[model samples]
Target: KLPPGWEKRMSRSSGRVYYFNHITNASQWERPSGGKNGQGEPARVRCSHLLVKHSQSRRPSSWRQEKITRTKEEALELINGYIQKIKSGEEDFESLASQFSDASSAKARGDLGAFSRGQMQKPFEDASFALRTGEMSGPVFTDSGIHIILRTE
Candidate 1:
């Protein structure tokens, strides 16, 4: 069930993803200063796509595209720089990811859990597929941005 006045926007290409936006009454858990109980202003939450890949090819059989990235080039540049830093030993992956990442997982240092081919963008899938566990890729560009990816077993 959705919150009152909440609406969903969906898109399907590589997979199925849903974008939810709404004006919701704030809950006591996130109330404004001095606000009365149950009397709150609007709030928003943005979620990332839920990606699911096929067992055989590791390609995405189904997934959700929750957010739209506006700066593909910039994202790529940032990711490339991040990978370079790691390879040069100038920065650790987790630290660089924390400082540079725009996703919620930045708090976890860009950890996307374990994933496989066709589960990600073409560039990302290719780079990651070529890597062994604990291997880091040279910077590769994707629709979201440039990435210096590390494969964790």
Candidate 2:
């Protein structure tokens, strides 16, 4: 772990491609650290997902992921902005889901449906069940990139 909100890589940007490094106590951060649903506490939660593979890839998991910013803060700004639109009713999850999700569930509007704690990536699992049906999570970093989650029943 290095520094939170540090930008790792950026695929493309406004006029061209861009790259920047966030330095701190360490030059490189291994992983993103956050909440969890590990041992002791346990429960399954039903949810949907919007996944984006990696910035290095030519593809976006879904259509909504069409953007140029790729660092933690940029990603956060991007994901959080989308959620805001969803909350304000300016955008629908399924639209963004089908348009932007990186998971196969994008066909189903990024619906992963139901899953339990520890069934997914540790950090991913932690952020998933941590929300109520109408609540939206900030972002959970994963190998699939960062994600903004909405828990819907």
lDDT of each: 0.45, 0.59
The 10 consecutive residues of candidate 1 with the worst lDDT sum are: 44-53
lDDT by residue (tens digit), candidate 2, 1-153: 222333445344444332222311111223333343433322667777766455633443444455534655655566767767876789987788788766767889877878876678776777765555654565567766767676775
Off by over 4 Å in 1: 1-80
| Per-residue lDDT of model 1, residues 1-153, tens digit only | 343333444445544444332221111121122223563322221111111112222221222233434344444455555555666788887776666554456666667776645567776655554443554554454545445566665
- In model 2, how large is the Cα lDDT of residue 88? 77
Q: How far out, in Å, is residue 82 in model 2?
A: 0.8
| lDDT (Cα) of model 2 | 0.59
TM-score of each: 0.46, 0.59
Flag regions of model 2 displaced more than 4 Å. 1-42, 56-74
